[PDB]
Symmetry: C3
Subunit: 441 residues, 3 copies
């Protein structure tokens, strides 16, 4: 879609809009199972060697489940427990008879829904029947001939089928029974798509999930659960996207300082509310660590667990940081160091002191030299930006940028009553302290 | 065991107790080795192809060792060097004759203790003898028949044996010779258990380590060391648990704010001493980043390298934050944003402003609507908590919660002399500033 | 080379010098390709089974590219976009005919340079020709005999060749098309070395990169790009080391507090400018998160994207923190907790309160007991340091340490006007506040 950007010279910040939301709001828990089997010449020795790998993988996973499974403004977030729902389901599976309900449900099929004893309705999947393979092809060789008649084409095939159990067990072993993202050994591409289609969700969610399998995997958990009655079962916890196609925008901020000659006499100010914003249910979901969100074209995948829910008036800070309805968050300092923030469609440059700051093009080199202050350049005709010894490549996606001129608000502050070293502050709090200092003077 | 929780309404915090400690206090360094060998039709070409994979894995690891191997209150921690002990041992192995001492010690066995030249006594393990396999089965095929007589069952078997060397080399290649956790290619489940049993430790440590192999792996390092005289050797650095079965408890904290109508007029306070606490040697080991500790049932595995050693009186902050023996750490602000902290046995809810905050059950939906302030609900009968647009699942483990009523201490502060934006502060420091402001007035 | 260390008792800090730089300053983008092919008894069924794995890997990667690819003083850094350059190249490859230019260029060879339509000159590599293998050996079996004549030695060989495609696809599936470090499936050791040799760089850069392949891998990206016209192509983004062999030094800092008896009456100060420093182009490249830099012997690999460019006078803070040319950064507090910082050649110990702080040797145990204050011990004759319940191993590399005596500067401050809880501050700012407090008194 249309991605557009606006740079606010007055506050050294830029907003990228045109994105659409896909917010993980909930969890779907599915129970994936693998049916187990309970149990010389060159080719048989390889079968016994592979069968040993199988026996020890089972013993390994049994040992691993002795315990129940577990695992600027970011400091404002709450603290969730990401696998609480999957662990709850996995707890129900240890209740007696519960494992047998699943074993029975998938006797004649590989996909089935099971209502568990506490009422939970979960999709169930038998992805590998080692029970049947071992019990139909390897058992005859090991007992009827007394380890005599065998062919190497079954050795090859057994290694293939056993490999996935060996890899699932490897992942759980280096991860204490909880893995994320969910690999293709836990759930192949075909199985996951099939799982998504049989999921009880909207057609929009199914299309969205199927066209972004790779993101679904990164937002999912595999929780190793139980081995009981020749059934190996792990819970796969999949994201529920309850907010889809609402507007999102990305706020980029950079330090705004005065540019006086005498070093140390300068005051700085930085908008601290940078991160991803998405309209959500009459409020705005604010993600202060924009690295928690994944962007695919103009779709942005975030997790509400790493969000604050803010009044929509928080948007007014971009056009009017002095607006009377939301108290815009800033931090203050006297550290006027140079840096750049690469935005979606351009680059913000905070250039101070003796720093060389330029913007270049691929074939012609330097096309703009920044003066001291906070400035911006759009990615049209620019390929790189240089601040000091640091070269930044700019994003080269299509979209129009608008440069909104305005006097930098740092000019409105008297440096001799300016409160420096304020981090979790706001426009009004800074004024509150300035008036108190001006009172005592 | 018995997990229990107490919520302190006065300070918006909760303590989970009943846990027992397993603290990594030291390191055991073992030297794992792989003995190397020094060195047409369809089946021989595959042997030569696999032999090439072997030769290049050796060349790769030789190239990789040109250099010596290397790798709220968290800011208070010191700075260790995690693989210093393994690197020290690995340095000793480059001394002349040192590699030959090991090669000799494991001539007749695969497990042996070797006292190295500087006095260090290390367990040694030969986990794969490629020297013997290549030198007994592949060498005859490549020289005696001139690449003639071969059978595919050896091609299969060679790929199996060579695979682990290829994978060990892959791990070291993407990790610059230092890996953690220690995979099952570095050390299989059988080898690690055997290593633990032959370790010079208590019977309690052996049982504890064997029943938590997956945690031992996550707290271990594999340091690629030396290739010399047909011997490949890497050091595996294993945790020493010198503190076991002492009481541990988890402190959860959340922001406590006043709830006045006029927005911006509110003051907030948050206990900053959240994290894991374990009794340790007459003091308390405090782990400010509770994500450094791993919980398995009621056992909690932590690393003393990420701890502060505090006076045990730090515990008094939970029952009496104004106690005269320890100066309880807090932070102050005026940012009254809503959030929840999911505890071990319930959920703390900091609900402010216009936020919808509720607690729900699986089948009946909303059972409690929180008013503004800091409140708590136990996981008995509750499955989810909702703060704004964020849905939290609560932990569903058994254990009793006690709600300790008390007036929120934020009510005891006059907002017009309240010092906001204090981060590394304490009860006494805040009083010190309030009295100084009250003096100048 | 010569690694040396100096400890400044006056400021509780230590500098390690003698290192030489290797700074990633730019990016080289190469286009790696795999040529694809467009498409019963026991041995044929395995071929059809492996061929299915191939078809689905292709379908998987096609689904994955529906979207364009994306991915104390650290807070002062700017914000780059690491794969912007590779993504830009990958965008050019979707232009029509562009894929065919590459397909043509590597018809007769596997390595070739191609000037793309926008002028970019990129190295191109065909690392696997599955097109030819499938189209010469498997096609005859599946069509001419009608799935009759086949031998197991080709089944083995097909699994080998197809395996790398299956693994590349696995990596991209768990990583949303962008991986780092660059595995040996993306680019084998031989291919990467060959790529480095054909790179348009200096002989120094080629030697440096070839002798540190493992670091090059960790600083590289694999960006999954396009599948078009039987050509699979991903961009490998390799580091350009434009700064080599300049001096580097590592600054370690630890809290310096007064040691009065009455607890709570103490004031602390910590130099905040700790991290890696490298001379670079007349300025100094400062890396505040020293964990972004990788050290190999005396060579230190850093990324300028995680640096500030500072005046070289920042070095004066080590010999004279009160120097008049650079305003040295510090933080203040009243939290006198004990801890240690393990340096390159010794250990800084900040010992306060009732903490037991000692230094030990391997065979003789405790050789020094620290008194309260900030002290230092060199790694000559010392193996471990203990602060409270935390045991630290010291680095055991050769190099001389010098202990520079001096009165701790915290003694020069009157505790009753000392501004505590200052984080982004400096020597002059603290004096500025002290004089303002002394004025109002
Ligand atoms: C991107 S950052 O959050 O990591 C950098 C913050 C560091 N910092 C501090 C100290 N401080 C923290 O470290 N936290 C974080 C971990 C809980 C705070 C939360 C609330 N108030 C102060 C906090 C003061 C200060 C003043 N100016 C600039 C930076 C400053
Ligand atoms: Cl870049
Ligand atoms: Cl949750
Ligand atoms: Cl250590």
């Amino acid at each position: 879609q249309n991605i557009t950007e606006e740079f606010y010279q007055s506050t050294c910040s830029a907003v990228s809009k045109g994105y659409l939301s896909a917010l993980r709001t909930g969890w779907y828990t599915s129970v994936i199972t693998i049916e187990l089997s309970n149990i010389t010449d060159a080719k048989v020795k390889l079968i016994k060697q592979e069968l040993d790998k199988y026996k020890n993988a089972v013993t390994e996973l049994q040992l691993l489940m002795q315990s129940t499974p577990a695992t600027f403004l970011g400091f404002l977030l709450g603290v969730g427990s990401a696998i609480a729902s999957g662990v709850a389901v996995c707890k129900v599976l240890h209740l007696e008879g519960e494992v047998n309900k699943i074993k029975s449900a998938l006797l004649s099929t590989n996909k089935a829904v099971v209502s568990l004893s506490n009422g939970v309705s979960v999709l169930t999947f038998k992805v590998l029947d080692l029970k049947n393979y071992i019990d139909k092809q390897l058992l005859p060789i090991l007992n009827k001939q007394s380890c005599s008649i065998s062919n190497i084409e079954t050795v090859i095939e057994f290694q293939q089928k056993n490999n996935r159990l060996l890899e699932i067990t490897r992942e759980f072993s280096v991860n204490a029974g909880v893995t994320t993202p969910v690999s293709t050994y836990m759930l192949t591409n075909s199985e996951l798509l099939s799982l998504i289609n049989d999921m009880p969700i909207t057609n929009d969610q199914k299309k969205l999930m199927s066209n972004n399998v790779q993101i679904v995997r990164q937002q999912s958990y595999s929780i190793m659960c139980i081995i009981k009655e020749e059934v190996l079962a792990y819970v796969v916890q999949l994201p529920l996207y309850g907010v889809i196609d609402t507007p999102c925008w990305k706020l980029h901020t950079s330090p705004l300082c005065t540019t006086n000659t005498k070093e140390g006499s300068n005051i700085c100010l930085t908008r601290t509310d940078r991160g991803w914003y998405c309209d959500n249910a009459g409020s705005v979901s604010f993600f202060p660590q924009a690295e928690t969100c994944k962007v695919q074209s103009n779709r942005v995948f975030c997790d509400t667990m790493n969000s604050l829910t803010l009044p929509s008036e928080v948007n007014l800070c971009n056009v009017d940081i002095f607006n009377p309805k939301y108290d815009c968050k800033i931090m203050t300092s006297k550290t006027d160091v140079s840096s750049s923030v690469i935005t979606s469609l351009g680059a913000i440059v905070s250039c101070y002191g003796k720093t060389k700051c330029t913007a270049s093009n691929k074939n012609r080199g330097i096309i703009k030299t920044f003066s001291n202050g906070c400035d911006y350049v759009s990615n049209k005709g620019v390929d790189t930006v240089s601040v000091g010894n640091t070269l930044y490549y700019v994003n080269k996606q299509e979209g129009k940028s608008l440069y909104v001129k305005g006097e930098p608000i740092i000019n409105f502050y008297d440096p001799l009553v300016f409160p420096s070293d304020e981090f979790d502050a706001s426009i009004s709090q800074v004024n509150e302290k300035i008036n108190q200092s001006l009172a005592f003077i």
